[PDB]
Amino acid sequence: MISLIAALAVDRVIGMENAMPWNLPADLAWFKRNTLDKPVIMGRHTWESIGRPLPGRKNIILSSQPGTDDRVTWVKSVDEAIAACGDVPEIMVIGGGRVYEQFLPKAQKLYLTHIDAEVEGDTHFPDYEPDDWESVFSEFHDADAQNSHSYCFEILERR
Ligand SMILES: [Ca+2]
């Protein structure tokens, strides 16, 4: 099964030109726990922003161009990205906006972090109809000494 994992603020904003104006270590723990030892699919832009391969995860990068980093696997299409993952229990799509948009229709589960922040962004998580999904897990947290804003984790399974 294919799953998407994403952190969205209001209006489904997931990305902008500059660094995000929030500090959320708790989402980073969440992210790590949910993707550990599972193959991750990402678009070129996200790859560039992370800058190194994610440790203890097979890394698949989608690009129309030839790859520039032999440490990861580069694919030229959605279908090949899938095939390069092999036979695994769960494939994680970690971004970005263009990528999620193409994988949403094939995903069976979503791992979302809702952040209570209003930011100007140029990238949005695709629109989804909550009714097509079953909320299997949800858990709210207030901002604290370590997390700049309140947030909520939620796990949705396709009905
Ligand atoms: Ca922003």
From Swiss-Prot:
Effect upon mutating residue 16 to N: Increases catalytic rate about 2-fold. Increases catalytic rate about 7-fold
Enzyme Commission no: 1.5.1.3
Protein name listed in UniProt: Dihydrofolate reductase
Major enzyme class: oxidoreductase
One record GO biological process: 10-formyltetrahydrofolate biosynthetic process
Effect noted on mutating residue 85 to A: Decreases catalytic rate by one third. Increases catalytic rate about 7-fold
Keyword terms: Antibiotic resistance, Methotrexate resistance, NADP, One-carbon metabolism, Oxidoreductase, Trimethoprim resistance
Gene Ontology MF terms in the entry: dihydrofolate reductase activity; dihydrofolic acid binding; folic acid binding; methotrexate binding; NADP binding; NADP+ binding; NADPH binding
Family that this chain belongs to: Belongs to the dihydrofolate reductase family.
Outcome of mutating residue 42 to Y: Increases catalytic rate almost 2-fold. Increases catalytic rate about 7-fold
Domain DHFR: 1-158
GO cellular component entries: cytosol
Gene name tied to this protein: folA
Upper classification of the organism: Bacteria, Pseudomonadati, Pseudomonadota, Gammaproteobacteria, Enterobacterales
Pathway of action: Cofactor biosynthesis; tetrahydrofolate biosynthesis; 5,6,7,8-tetrahydrofolate from 7,8-dihydrofolate: step 1/1
Pfam family, one: DHFR_1
Residues noted as binding NADP(+) in the record, renumbered to the chain: 7, 13-19, 45-46, 63-64, 76, 95-102
Function: Key enzyme in folate metabolism. Catalyzes an essential reaction for de novo glycine and purine synthesis, and for DNA precursor synthesis.
Other comments on record: The strain K12 sequence is shown. Strain B [RT500] is resistant to 500 micrograms per milliliter of trimethoprim.
Catalytic activity: (6S)-5,6,7,8-tetrahydrofolate + NADP(+) = 7,8-dihydrofolate + NADPH + H(+)
Taxonomic source organism: Escherichia coli (strain K12)
Residues involved in substrate binding: 5, 27, 52, 57, 113
Annotated consequence of substituting residue 152 to S: Increases catalytic rate 1.5-fold. Increases catalytic rate about 7-fold
